Amino acid sequence: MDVMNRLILAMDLMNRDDALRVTGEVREYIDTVKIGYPLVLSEGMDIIAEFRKRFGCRIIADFKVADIPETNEKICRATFKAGADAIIVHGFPGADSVRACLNVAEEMGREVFLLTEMSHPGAEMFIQGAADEIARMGVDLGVKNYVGPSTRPERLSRLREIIGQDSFLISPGVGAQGGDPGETLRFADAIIVGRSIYLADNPAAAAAGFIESIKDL
């Protein structure tokens, strides 16, 4: 995957008008938008096709898929039907649940991103202790795309070590949650940025600023 400016917009605004306006304002800086449940549950899955019609951007569906294999398959099918190019899947529910997603992705053209360790404080309770093993499971399953935490660069670096330089790694927690853009890009291929752009007084200036920060990367 080739992400313009190594910057993925996390579009978690919850109304269509604002979400479309803000995305339009920063469109020159990106070609990849992560759309999650806050927007989809507020405005419907039709929002994905609309983003493609308006912006001709890549769409990552951040649905943190975390069900049994049978249900995971249905979720992936519905999601790719809506025009998502990729979907984010939790590793914690185990290999069969990940494989179900990989199967559908193969069938419909698309990519699976495996979420290993999460960026928020609560990730330390259960996820962190499992995260290296989750990454190894991804490697065993042939997963090529991964998500790991900007807020813990040593954990992100370890994730990169496990999956190797050939795998693709994106990383949230930049800005609002405390992660640094430049440091994150030592290890990740792209950074995910939500609030620091979409809640900014001037989202365009915010996006430009991030790119300035990582300009020599």
Which of 64, 108, 200, 211 lies at the binding interface for a copy of itself (CB under 8 A)?
64
199 binds a copy of itself (CB under 8 A): no
CA distance 148 to 135: 10
Shortest Cβ distance from residue 102 to a copy of itself (Å)? 13
Question: Is residue 64 among the annotated active site residues?
Answer: yes
Using the contact rule CB under 6 A, the part of the chain among 23-31, 98-106, 152-160, 193-201 near ligand BMP is 193-201
CA distance 16 to 121: 30
Q: 69 with 96: CB under 8 angstroms?
A: yes
172 binds ligand BMP (CB under 6 A): yes
Task: Identify the active-site residue in 53, 64, 74, 215.
Answer: 64
103 binds ligand BMP (CB under 6 A): no
Q: How many residues bind a copy of itself (CB under 8 A)?
A: 50
| Rg (the chain; Cα; Å) | 16
In DSSP notation, 29-71 reads G-SEEEEEHHHHHHH-THHHHHHHHHH--EEEEEEEE-S-HHH
Token pair, residue 27, equals 């469109």
Shortest Cβ distance from residue 62 to a copy of itself (Å)? 8
Side chain identity, residue 64: K
Sign of CA dihedral 114, 117, 120, 124: positive
State which residue, 15 or 202, has the beta carbon closest to a copy of itself: 15
**Which residue's entry shows tokens 């670096």?**
157
118 binds ligand BMP (CB under 6 A): yes
Residue 144 CA, chain-centre distance (Å), reads 14
Residues that bind ligand BMP (CB under 6 A): 10, 12, 36, 62, 67-68, 71, 115, 118-119, 147, 149, 172-177, 192-196
Catalytic residues: 64
Residues that bind a copy of itself (CB under 8 A): 12, 14, 36-38, 40-42, 44-45, 63-64, 66-71, 74-75, 77-79, 81-82, 90-98, 118-127, 130, 133-134, 137, 177, 195
